Amino acid sequence: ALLTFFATDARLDPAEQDRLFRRVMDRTFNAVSIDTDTSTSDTAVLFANGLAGEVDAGEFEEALHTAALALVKDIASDGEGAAKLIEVQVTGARDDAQAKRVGKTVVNSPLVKTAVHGCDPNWGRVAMAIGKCSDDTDIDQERVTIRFGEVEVYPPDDALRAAVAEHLRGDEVVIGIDLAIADGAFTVYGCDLTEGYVRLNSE
Template sequence: MKKRSICAVEGVTACGMKEGKFGLALIRATGTAAGVFTENLVKAAPIQLMRTQIRKGKLDAVIVNSGCANAYTGQKGYEDAVVMTEYASSALGLEPDRIGVASTGVIGRYLDLPLIRKQCVAVAPALASSAEAETHAAAAIMTTDTVQKHALVEKETFTVAGICKGSGMIAPNMGTMLAFIYTDADVGAKQLRDSLKLATKRSFNRVVVDGDSSTNDIALCTATGEAGKVREEEFSAALEECCRSLAKQIAADGEGATKLLEIRVTGAVKESDAARVARTVIESPLVKTAVYGEDPNWGRVVAAAGRARVKFDPNAVSLWISDGKNKYPLVKSGEIIADLKKAKQAMSGKTVIFILDLAAGREEASAWGCDLTERYVEINGRYTT
């Protein structure tokens, strides 16, 4: 089904193409721009270039390739990333220093620049604000993803929307994900940076598929300003909602995954404490494999929470399990009260949610991930061969 999200934002056009595992997408939108990037020490060439480009606070377009990450490629890789912006500049009639660049795929391989140039020339004339054009763009940036990922948040006076890719090598501090977010709100550079940083903290940085953090992670947000000024709080909330939707789609599409796993932590002294516990539980291989096996092993959840380096009283915590509709108690104030049959039933669907109350304060946070299956090993055991 064709979806329209970023192309529903005033001032945005897009398109893309895929040839085997090699794809290229172009997204054109002029406006204030901000970005967040991987914290991995080994940063890919496009990340190095974008950290410089984004300081100007303005973008006119983005060029994205899939199939080759252009990571761990030295000076040649950096020069190749610059060449990508020049290709887009020539094809779109824009200045190269106003073009964002991103790459995803195999690490330690050089770009096929002739292919990228050919694809860029083919894609540029097809840019449009249609659902079909956006579908081509979203498909072009996929690697091991099995589904496209779109998000659309429509408010009374403005819109925030995004597309992203991400399936494996996903961990907090951003995983192997590329996100391109657009709004028609008129947002200043500082506000956009602050809002994107907070939204990322509460969404992309709380997703764990396998605990590996990539070299290429990037989330870019461009504000075209077509809808005029909006209240700062309303914009920030809408941006967070959009990012959270994309983050959950990444988690649900984890490599080899059969279930979306959500951990909700309440009753923490600080939000950062709740987030730390949620992330620790969501990344636990023991929890993830139990979810795959539909084994309601609440002991693994509590044990993982206990190694998060957050202070709470284990004898005061409460824990529930849910399938998104029904909610069943497992532990109440440290006492095990689980109905094993109901708990196992709650794990039989596509979504499994654990709600953990630390009983230590009033702050809360959520994290998202997926189960860990044999298919994950199959995908990553032969990724380059």
């Protein structure tokens, strides 16, 4: 499924370039799911010929990131037969690895995906999904907080209810999740589940 090729004329130290490339792929292309079906063919390449001279590596990783993250969002906005992007902002994990683990499970929950497709701020399903991380016993359902947009819906006026409904009617939906454990943070990307996805992949 996934093929992505980058090309630059900046001159970059081979070693430092390989690190900033992994670091960026980990926060970008390794942080997106449409249907969990990791493929037999995923490929991500960066070619850097020096026909533009030395460029500050720390500034190229920023640009490489902004660029990778731009394609990622395109991918997730164009998920097969999707209609809205989903972004799971996980914070307060014990560490980033965990925070990602939690985002993936949330963003791959068919019930979560369908709730979102239905414009439903179904935090109970977000909670359920969070719950599926059953080996993460420092996840305390009393310390977990869940939000749609900026608006926090868990733990549980009429204006904020309307704010959230408008947020879920849109095409890019943000699920915020704080675990209240440590400083672990990570954001993943995916989409709603629709009959179009089924119809295309069924046909």
